[PDB]
Amino acid sequence: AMETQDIIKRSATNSITPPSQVRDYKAEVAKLIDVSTCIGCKACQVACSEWNDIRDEVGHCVGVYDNPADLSAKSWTVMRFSETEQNGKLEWLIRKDGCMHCEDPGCLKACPSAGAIIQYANGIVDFQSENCIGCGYCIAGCPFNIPRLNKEDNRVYKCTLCVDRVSVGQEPACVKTCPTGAIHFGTKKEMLELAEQRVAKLKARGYEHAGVYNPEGVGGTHVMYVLHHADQPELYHGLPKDPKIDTSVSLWKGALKPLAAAGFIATFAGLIFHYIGIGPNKEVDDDEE
Amino acid sequence: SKSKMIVRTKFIDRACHWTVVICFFLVALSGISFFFPTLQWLTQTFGTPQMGRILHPFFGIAIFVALMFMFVRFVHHNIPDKKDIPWLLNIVEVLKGNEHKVADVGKYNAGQKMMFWSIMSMIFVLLVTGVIIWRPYFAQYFPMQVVRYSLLIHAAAGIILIHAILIHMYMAFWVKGSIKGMIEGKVSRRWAKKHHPRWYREIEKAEAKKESEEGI
Amino acid sequence: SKSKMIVRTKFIDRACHWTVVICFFLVALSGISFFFPTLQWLTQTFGTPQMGRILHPFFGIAIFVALMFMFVRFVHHNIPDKKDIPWLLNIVEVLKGNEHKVADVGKYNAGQKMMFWSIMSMIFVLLVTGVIIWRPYFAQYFPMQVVRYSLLIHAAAGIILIHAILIHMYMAFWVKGSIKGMIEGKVSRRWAKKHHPRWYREIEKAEAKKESEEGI
C-alpha cells in the first residue's frame, strides 16, 4: 500500500500518523456531467461495466426505463430518470448517478478499518479491498448513498473514477464513451470553467436557476453536475440539496472517541489508585491489629 | 451458624454468569477494535478483522439471551426500596470499606442493583441498535437516518457497558471472597454478616426456623 | 510488637511506584520492538508501530520525572556504608535464603541499594541519550557523531535497565510478602525481623520510646 506516495486521507488512521503523501503536487481532476445535454442512452453504464470487468444480473422491468434500478456491487453507475411538470411543462430529467468523489468523504470518515478507504492527491476516493471488513459503516456515512456490498466477498465497491486509467494519463471509460458530450473530464479548475460557461448558455435560454452542483457541505466534489434547475436538485431523482456529513456520524466518529478514551484512562487510574489507597475489603481488617 | 459457608449462588446461575463473561470478553474486545482502530491487535480478537466483523453480533445475541435468563432469576432481588437510600447517601463511606456502619444491606446492595439495571438496560439498547446496524441481514430494512442514529447510540451504549463491567469486576476483586462465591457458589457466614447483614439474617432465620418447625 | 503489620511505604511512594511500573511496561516493550524487530507483536505496544515511535520518548520522560521524585524520597536510605560489606561477601548465602545469618540489614539491603543506583543511573543515561536521538524535536541540534554514539548507548542502557528490572521483580516475587507492602503499604513485624532486622529494631525503638516519652 502507499506505493504512490500521494495518499492525502486514509480511513481509520490516527491524525498524528498521516499516510505517505510527499508526492502531492498534482492537479485535482474532475468529471462534469451536464444533465442538460444527457440523452439517457446508458452508454456510460455499459462502458463502465465493460471496462471494469463486472456484470450485474439481468433484472426486470417494473414500469420505468431505469435499469438496473439501483447502484450495486456489479453496477457502479446508473442512469436515474424523472418525469415532472413542476416547472410548468413536461420535462424528462435524466441524471447519471454514482460516487461523487467528495473532497471530505463521509465513507472514509465512518470506516473503522485502517486503509480500507483512501483519498489520492488528485481527488479520487478509492476502496482498498484487502482491508475491507464488510461492516457497511461507509453506506451510512456517505451523504449520497453510494457504497454497495458484494454478497460474494463481503466487501463494498463503487465508481473508482477509473483510477486505473487516470493514474496513467487516460480519461475514464464513461467520459470517453458519452455520445453527446454530456460527460466532460479534465482538471477540476477547467471543469469549473466549462461548468460556468454552460450555466451562462442555459440562463440565456431561459433557465434562470441553472447552476453547478459542487456541494460545499462535503468540501466540493470531483464529480460535478450542470443542472437546469439547480434550485431544485431533488427533481433529479432525489439528488440532495445541500448535502453534508450527518451530525450523528460526525459526533460518533469525532468527539465520542477521545471522550471515551478519557473516561477509560480516568476510570483505570481511579480504580487503581483507589485499591492502593484504601486496600482490600476482606472479612476482617480489624483482627489485623 | 455452624458451617464455614452458606450457598449464595446456584450452579445454574454460576454457569450462566461465566458463559456471559467469556462471550463478553470477545464481544467487548472486537467492539473496541472498531471503536479505536489504532489498537490493531484487537482486530485479531476473533482471529482476523473480517471474521470479527461477522462474529461480534452473533456472540452479542448470545450474551443478551443469557442476560435475559439472569434477568428473570435475579430481578426480584434487585428492586430498589426505601432501605437503599442510606447506601446512596454514604457512598464515600462505603468506598472506604465502611458500608456496614452506614447502611442496611440485603441480598445485593444498592450499588449492585444500580449496576444490574445499568447492565440490563444497556444490553437491551445494544440489542436493538445492534440489529438495526447489522449487515447483511437487517440494516437494509431501516431508513438510513435510523441506521445512523443506531450507529451513534450502539457505540455509546457499548462504551458505557464496558466501563460499567470494569467497575463491576473491580468491586468483585475488591470485596474479597466474592469471586469464590461466583465460582464455587459458597460464602462464609462472616462475609455474609459484614457485606450483607439483612440477607444472612434471613437465611439464618429461614434455616433455623424451618428446622425448628420440623420438631427436632 | 502487638500489631500484625508495620507501615513500610507511604501511599504517595506507592502511587508513584505503580505509575512508574505501568509506564515502564509500555516503554520497555516499545523499546524492545525496535531492538528486536523479529518480535513483531511488540510493534503494537502503543497500538501501531508509527504510534509507538511517537509515544515511547514521552512516556520515557514521565518515568524519569517520577523516578526523580522517588530519588529524593529514598536516596538517604540507599546510601552505601561499611555495614553493607558483609552482604556483598555472602551473596551466595543470601541467594539461598539465609541472609539474616550472614548480614546486617537496615531499611533496604545492599542488593537493593545497588539496584537503586543502577536504576537511577541508567534512567539518567536514557534521558540524555534519548533526548539526543529524538526526532523531530532535538536530534537536529546534535552533531551526527554524537547522535550515533547516543543511539549505541541508549540501546545498551535500555537493555541493562530491562535486565535490572527483571531481577528487581523476581526478588520482589521471591522475598514473599514484599508485593503486598508495595500495594497496601504494610509489612508484618516478622518479615521486618527476618529480612530487615536493624530497620525494624529502629521503628520499634522510635515507636515504644516516643510513646514512653509521652509519659503514659
Ligand code: HEM
Ligand atoms: C446485543 C447484541 C449486539 C448486537 C446485535 C451487536 C451488533 C453490532 C454490529 C452489527 C456492529 C458493527 C460491526 C460488525 O458488524 O461487526 C457492532 C459494533 C460494536 N458493538 Fe455491538 N453488538 C451487540 C452487543 C454488543 C455489546 C454487548 C457490546 C459491548 C461490549 C458491543 C459493543 C460494540 C462496539 C463498541 C461497536 C463498535 C462501535 C464503533 O465502531 O464505534 N456490542 N455491534
Ligand code: HEM
Ligand atoms: C471477570 C469478569 C467478572 C467478574 C469477576 C464478576 C464477578 C461477579 C461476582 C463475584 C458476582 C456475584 C457477587 C455477589 O455474590 O454479590 C457477580 C454477579 C453478577 N454479574 Fe458478574 N462478574 C464479571 C463479569 C460480568 C459481566 C461481563 C456481566 C454481564 C455484562 C456480569 C453480570 C453479572 C450480574 C447481572 C450479576 C448479579 C448481580 C445482581 O443481581 O445485582 N458479570 N459478578
Ligand code: HEM
Ligand atoms: C528517559 C527517557 C527516554 C527517552 C527521551 C527515550 C527516547 C527514545 C527514542 C527517541 C528512541 C528511538 C525511537 C523513537 O523515537 O521512538 C528510543 C529507543 C529506545 N529506547 Fe528509549 N527513551 C527513554 C527511556 C527509555 C527507557 C526507560 C528504556 C528501557 C525500558 C528505553 C529503551 C529504549 C530502547 C531499547 C530503544 C531502541 C534501541 C534500538 O532501536 O536498538 N528508553 N528511546
Ligand code: HEM
Ligand atoms: C511488576 C514490576 C515491579 C515489582 C513487582 C516491584 C516490586 C517492588 C517492591 C515490592 C518494592 C519495595 C520492596 C521493599 O519494601 O523492600 C519496590 C521498590 C522499588 N521499586 Fe519496584 N517493582 C517493580 C517495578 C519497578 C520498576 C519498573 C521500577 C523503575 C524502573 C522500580 C523502582 C523501584 C524503586 C526505586 C524501589 C525502591 C527500592 C530502594 O529504595 O532501594 N520498580 N519494587
Ligand SMILES: CCCCCCCc1cc(O)c2ccccc2[n+]1[O-]
Ligand atoms: C456510585 C458507585 C457505584 C458502585 C457500584 C456497586 C456495584 C458493586 C458493589 C459490590 O460490593 C459488589 C460485590 C460483588 C459483585 C459486584 C458488586 N458490585 O456491582
Ligand SMILES: CCCCCCCc1cc(O)c2ccccc2[n+]1[O-]
Ligand atoms: C549481586 C546480586 C544483586 C541482587 C539484587 C538485590 C536487589 C533486591 C533484593 C531484595 O530482597 C528485594 C526485595 C524487594 C524489592 C526489591 C529487592 N531487590 O531489589
Ligand code: SF4
Ligand atoms: S453516456 Fe452520456 S448521454 Fe448517455 S446516459 Fe450517460 S451521461 Fe447521458
Ligand code: SF4
Ligand atoms: S464496509 Fe469496508 S470500506 Fe465500508 S466502512 Fe466497512 S471496512 Fe470500511
Ligand code: SF4
Ligand atoms: S459520494 Fe459517498 S462513497 Fe463517494 S466519496 Fe463521497 S462519501 Fe464516499
Ligand code: SF4
Ligand atoms: S469514472 Fe469509471 S468507474 Fe466511474 S462510472 Fe465512469 S467508467 Fe465507471
